[PDB]
Amino acid sequence: LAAGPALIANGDELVAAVWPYRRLALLRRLTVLPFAGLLYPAWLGAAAAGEAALLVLATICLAHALTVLSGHWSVHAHCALTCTPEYDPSKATFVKVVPTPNNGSTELVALHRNEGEDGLEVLSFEFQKIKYSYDALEKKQFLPVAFPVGNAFSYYQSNRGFQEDSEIRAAEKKFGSNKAEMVVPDFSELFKERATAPFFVFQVFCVGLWCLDEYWYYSVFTLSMLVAFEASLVQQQMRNMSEIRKMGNKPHMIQVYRSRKWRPIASDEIVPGDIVSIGRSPQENLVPCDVLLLRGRCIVDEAMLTGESVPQMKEPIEDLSPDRVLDLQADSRLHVIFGGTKVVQHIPPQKATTGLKPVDSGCVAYVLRTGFNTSQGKLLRTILFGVKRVTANNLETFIFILFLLVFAIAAAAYVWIEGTKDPSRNRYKLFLECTLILTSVVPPELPIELSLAVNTSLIALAKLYMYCTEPFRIPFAGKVEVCCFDKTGTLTSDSLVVRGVAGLRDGKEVTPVSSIPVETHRALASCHSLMQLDDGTLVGDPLEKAMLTAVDWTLTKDEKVFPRSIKTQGLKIHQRFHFASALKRMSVLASYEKLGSTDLCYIAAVKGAPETLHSMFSQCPPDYHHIHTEISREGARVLALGYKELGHLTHQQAREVKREALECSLKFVGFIVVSCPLKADSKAVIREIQNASHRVVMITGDNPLTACHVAQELHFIEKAHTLILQPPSEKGRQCEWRSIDGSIVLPLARGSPKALALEYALCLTGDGLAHLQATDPQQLLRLIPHVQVFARVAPKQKEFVITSLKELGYVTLMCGDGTNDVGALKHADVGVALLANAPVKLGDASIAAPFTSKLSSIQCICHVIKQGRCTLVTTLQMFKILALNALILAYSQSVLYLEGVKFSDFQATLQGLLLAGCFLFISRSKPLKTLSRERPLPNIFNLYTILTVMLQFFVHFLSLVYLYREAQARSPEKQEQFVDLYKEFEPSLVNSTVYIMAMAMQMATFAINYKGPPFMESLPENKPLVWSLAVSLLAIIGLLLGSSPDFNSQFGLVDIPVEFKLVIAQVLLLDFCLALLADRVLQFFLGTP
């Protein structure tokens, strides 16, 4: 009873406010009571009591249709129109959930009512597939389903598994099953969404109006064609949606400990609280859920979260203090494995320790979170519903229609006022004429035309092997200002190349692996964690894979390693002390036979962090720190190598005397230097983008030093010094800017970032981002536009950076290959996924991005910009031309009918066919190959576009007034103050002159506004358009000329007197010249920002 306003806990990330509403019964809905109860019964009663009534009914019917559809157009309008608020939750039926800003759209979700275990009524709802339950007893608040997170580490040691099924069903009712099912919306739902679009409703209303104009045969055909076309577009959308279903996650068998026994169960029946075995699967199966590693060790590639292509070691929680509270923020880096991550390698629990062992020898782990609540699940939620689908229904299009409608209202008011001055006119025809003027001034083709233009650009893109799922985002590619790039797999290859070993020769020179000492070959060949599978495939860490391949050694199943190329004796590995994060090092015991003796000589090979072996080396080069710092500044990963010959060990001592001394008196044996190379195309494409006057920004999850180096190599940073903001490690110092070299350290100041961002380049780390978000979000928002590199950025922080850039009114482009970009790709205005390793399964990024390249080359982006500018100019040019034609139409439609002249049906038909042809040839114009330094106009609202439309219309208007008066002065005087209404078209001199002039001026209007020498193919290159303009100019000259009366008669032209012919030709030429000069002068004066 009686939950107040705003029923959510402060600090929920998804939902800002929750108000319950109950749906009204059908008869009590405001869609029916005012409709079924009042207006129609009074009309029916007047009808039974015995044409004007039907018209008044139709306007009532139209108002009703718009009110019902407005509930479809807005969930807020739907709630107001169909539901009432109810403070008592027992009587409520639905809840309208408003998400936090940027976290989607407001939805109306049904409330689920469930009986609890106690027989108590548990109210719950599911919003965006997350269940929120109302806690009625303690807090009287809605809480998200609490996962067993932040618990003490006593609970996890005592869990064993569940020997029951009632509690399992209870857990299933509370948390739900791990459902990764992609629900494909039904065809009917997408088609219903489309049929309620404002434009389609307006077009169907226009079809209804032609049915109202007695076009019985014509209206049904046009309606069927319109519906079939929208259905075909829906079919294409369904095709795009079926691939998303094709992604999903395949059901697989996993080992689960249930009812005191280990059993294989399908991954969908796993519930939180189960203890599961997680291991390297032979099918390259992904981890199904977020799991805490209880026992056993694993190397996992967490490519999904850090974007770093490099596997991270995960350690069991068994070695830690049980009193520690689980912090998901701190412990997840070392102790949590996320769902969908790949287990590269696993180490089974030691046989000596008492406890649970799985049959498959996987690691035993406890499931923390399942389904859509995992980090992958969070990504997937953003994939399904995280941005409004871009429709043709742009605010620009609606304002443009409203502008033309103001002018059409003025024209219709003029026709109404003058037609009401003549009392003889039948009011039905005057209303019909006004309605036809209103419906034809606003042509039905504008959105179809725009979609055809977009589809032509789509066909042009398909030939470049770029697929586009959301075509209406292409014009935004013309507006892109900031291009954000990921590093890994996009600008660099995922393939790591070993450059060699440094510190072997005097100086900095990296000696190639072919020229390193025999001790270095032995150190690289023995100091590895690679293993041989039963099938002989080599499995394990890519860095290690590169190391073993570069040294040309082979590992056998017996953990023996033999050289292929070097005439050295093989090594047998006996014991590995794996890399411990606490020790920052790994060691291997290997033996070799001595040359000419059967005596086994044992050796210790050590690798680890340079800072740790520095203190572990017995003899260290003086330049060790210099060399290390300089190589780390080159963005390479550096490992130190240590070597020791142990001589003869007894077989018992070699296994036991190892534990007593793992590390001491190490010999320095060099630095292994590994680089990730740049892609060969990256520098040229990035130079083209910078040359096109676009700002380049880097946003990557990789380490800041390597990312900054690669960004420098790509000229993302042209400045001499790069400053990294470090957050305070301790509560209370301010954040510090540190040079890449460390030479310059500056405190942060509340001053203007322009001064720092003019002299230095700024790189913000993810830890620094989180610190600024907690401390000063406004300074962060002021800083973001001035940063050049974002490093160690999490996917949600990538989203936040993109959204922050969008809030400043920048049009953003994101390019990525990884799922790490999915949030940014969806939220970017133009997301382009590249497939990593170009030469079927689709990685989620190729589904998440609006655009997908089948090539791993970034040159596609240059193509997208080339295409986007073309499309952006085309639509804007079309809008201008269409506005001009509409005003020409608006003035031709009523003033001429007020003067009583009409086009001939044949004349009008030919004019229409030529007009339709010209728009078809204009919409197919191609972009130029080169990216201009000049930028196109971004928006329809510019001073230039308004003033050019106004001035061209005014010129054309003055021409029409002049020629109408000259025709009236030459037309015979009419002894009638009033024009009859539907006069059978008699070819008159006035009709012929105004028609020929209107056609010539309207064709000039086509010719004048196409502008493309920096942006589109030139006029002589669009040959179809050239033929259209040449045929129309030849037609205009032939029609004006009168060498044959019969030819004019098929066209219905009257022979024009030669004296008047000369005046017409001179004024039409002057009109063309003046309108051209006007447009060119206004472009010269007002273009560019």
Question: Which three-class secondary structure state does DSSP give residue 483?
Answer: strand
Asked if 482 contacts 811 with a C-beta cutoff of 8 angstroms, the reply is: yes
Q: What string of DSSP letters covers 351-409?
A: TTS-S---TT--EEEEEEE-GGGSHHHHHHHHHHSSSPPP-S--HHHHHHHHHHHHHHH
* Cα–Cα distance for residue pair 685/999, rounded to 1 Å: 46
Does 579 appear as a known binding residue? yes
Query: How far is residue 736 from each of residues 492, 686, 744, 768, measured CA to CA in Å?
Result: 30, 30, 10, 10
Longest CA pairwise span in the chain (Å): 132
Does 817 appear as a known binding residue? yes
Please indicate whether residue 486 is annotated as part of the active site: yes
First to last CA, the chain: 59
For residue 889, which of 903, 873, 905, 906 has the smallest C-alpha distance?
A: 903
Does 10 appear as a known binding residue? no
The number of beta carbons lying within 10 Å of the beta carbon of residue 859 is 15
The DSSP letter of residue 584 is: T
Query: How far is residue 97 from each of residues 17, 93, 103, 143, 683, measured CA to CA in Å?
Result: 7, 13, 12, 14, 47
Write b or e for each residue in 918-954: b if 16 or more Cβ atoms lie within 10 A of its Cβ, otherwise e: bbbbbbbbbbbeebeeebbbbebeeeebeebbebbbe
* Cα–Cα distance for residue pair 612/232, rounded to 1 Å: 65
Strands 789-791 and 761-765: parallel
Does 186 appear as a known binding residue? no
Strands 722-726 and 761-765: parallel
* Cα–Cα distance for residue pair 970/836, rounded to 1 Å: 75
For residue 229, which of 448, 421, 531 has the smallest C-alpha distance?
A: 448
Query: How far is residue 386 from each of residues 77, 347, 376, 804, 822, measured CA to CA in Å?
Result: 22, 39, 14, 16, 10
For the purposes of burial, counting CB atoms within 10 Å of the CB of 22, is it exposed (0-12), middle (13-18) or buried (19 or more)? middle
Q: What string of DSSP letters covers 231-263?
A: HHHHHHHHHHHHHHHHHS----EEEEEETTEEE
Q: Identify residue 229 by its one-letter amino acid code.
A: F
Does 370 appear as a known binding residue? no
Does 552 appear as a known binding residue? no
* Cα–Cα distance for residue pair 178/165, rounded to 1 Å: 17
Asked if 113 contacts 121 with a C-beta cutoff of 8 angstroms, the reply is: yes
Residue from 360, 486, 541, 844 carrying the catalytic annotation: 486
Does 488 appear as a known binding residue? yes
Please give the helix or strand (H or E) that residue 140 lies within, else none. none
* Bridge partners, residue 832, by sequence: 815, 851
List the binding residues.
Answer: 486-488, 579, 637, 702, 817-821
List the binding residues for Mg(2+).
Answer: 486, 488, 817
List the binding residues for ATP.
Answer: 486-488, 579, 637, 702, 817-821
Which residues are known catalytic residues? 486
